[PDB]
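does this look right to u?? zinc ion version
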Amino acid sequence: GSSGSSGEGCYVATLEKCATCSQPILDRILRAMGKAYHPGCFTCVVCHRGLDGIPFTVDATSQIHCIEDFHRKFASGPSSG
Ligand SMILES: [Zn+2]
Ligand SMILES: [Zn+2]
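got this back:
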């Protein structure tokens, strides 16, 4: 099994780079968490659902967790740490 693929993306023209796939946004730029991401890349880490137009919450791990999940993971009873 061979694995190799370069990423032709060095130059930049008044465009933001997706903080998910590391690609230059040209079609549409979705502002989230201060940074810029693709309107399709932005998704949950657990359920992996599109959060393009819905509330969410992140953590130290930087793993955007949809309110629901976050409420089912973090809010799963008495926890501390
Ligand atoms: Zn992307
Ligand atoms: Zn989720």
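The longest helix spans residues 67-73. idk if thats expected tbh
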